[PDB]
Amino acid sequence: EVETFAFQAEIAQLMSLIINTFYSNKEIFLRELISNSSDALDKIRYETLTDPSKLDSGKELHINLIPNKQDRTLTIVDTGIGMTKADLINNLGTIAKSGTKAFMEALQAGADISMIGQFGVGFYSAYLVAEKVTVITKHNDDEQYAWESSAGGSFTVRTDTGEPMGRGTKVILHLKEDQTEYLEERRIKEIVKKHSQFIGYPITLFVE
Ligand SMILES: Oc1cc(O)c(-c2[nH]ncc2N2CCNCC2)cc1Cl
């Protein structure tokens, strides 16, 4: 049913840093997530140039932003390449260990948390605004899985028989009580325009 894993130490330390460091410019989490979706979309596109059957699981390549004020969630959905169970456990397809080391050295040398995505671990910026993060993913080579973590040094993985998605990745941000501004249409639009203005795939902001 539900397997429980420990974060590697360097990632545990990364997440604590994200959670505990005073840092006002939290909005960058959205750019880091959209940028991950854009990379996964690039990968499926590239693979389909030589094998168009990789798109049998869906031809449209796009990103949906879905705010839900009742559940207090902001969900980012892409139809990118998705992740296998293995990628998920291996820090969501990141080089999180070396990238964390590089990020923490930069933070010495003068960097601030906004540059996180330069070290390949921009996912973890979700913890600027979310108390809990659920990642649902479907890669053509595997079943649908849900990854989940409220930080605290551990994460879980289970098969998801919730609502099949076809192919891609869904990041559900259960927002901290004081970060509900990221559910406001005006606010999301501003941020996307500010930081995600040239992404090569349509980004659709859902209405409530
Ligand atoms: O927010 C995401 C969105 C995604 O589409 C993915 C994903 N799906 N397939 C590969 C990936 N990535 C993109 C970022 N780099 C690791 C692997 C991962 C994450 Cl964490």
For the chain, domain boundaries: 1-208
Q: How far is the CA of 84 from the centre of ligand 1 (A)?
A: 11
Q: How distant, in Å, are the alpha carbons of 70, 110, 130, 190 from that of 121?
A: 30, 18, 16, 24
Long-range pairs of 82-85 with CB within 8 A, sequence gap ≥ 24: 82/40, 82/137, 82/138, 82/139, 82/140, 82/142, 82/167, 82/168, 82/169, 83/135, 83/137, 83/139, 83/145, 83/169, 84/139, 84/141, 84/142, 85/142, 85/143, 85/145, 85/157
User: Given the CA of residue 87, which atom of ligand 1 is nearest to it?
Assistant: 17
Q: Are 75 and 30 in contact (CB under 8 A)?
A: no
Helices 28-50 and 185-195 pack at an angle, to 10 degrees, of 60
CB atoms within 10 A of CB 175: 21
User: Given the CA of residue 80, which atom of ligand 1 is nearest to it?
Assistant: 5
CATH superfamily of 1-208: Histidine kinase-like ATPase, C-terminal domain (3.30.565.10)
The closest alpha carbon to 24, from 148, 181, 159, belongs to: 181
The closest alpha carbon to 11, from 91, 88, 81, belongs to: 91
d(CA 147, CA 135): 5
User: Given the CA of residue 41, which atom of ligand 1 is nearest to it?
Assistant: 5
Resolution (A): 1.8
Alpha helices in 60-207 (DSSP H): 85-89, 96-108, 185-195
Reading the block at residue 93, the tokens are 């397809």
Q: Are 41 and 150 in contact (CB under 8 A)?
A: no
Pocket test for ligand 1, best of 33, 37, 84 (most atoms within 8 A of CB): 37
Strand order in the sheet with 168-175: 2-6, 154-159, 145-149, 130-138, 168-175, 73-78, 63-68, 203-205
Reading the block at residue 52, the tokens are 């168009």
d(CA 63, CA 41): 9
Q: How far is the CA of 208 from the centre of ligand 1 (A)?
A: 26
DSSP structure class, residue 180? G
How big is the CA angle at 125 (ends 128 and 6), to the nearest 5 degrees? 100
d(CA 116, CA 188): 20
Pocket test for ligand 1, best of 11, 36, 63, 139 (most atoms within 8 A of CB): 36
Which residue has a Cα nearest atom 10 of ligand 1? 40
d(CA 58, CA 167): 7
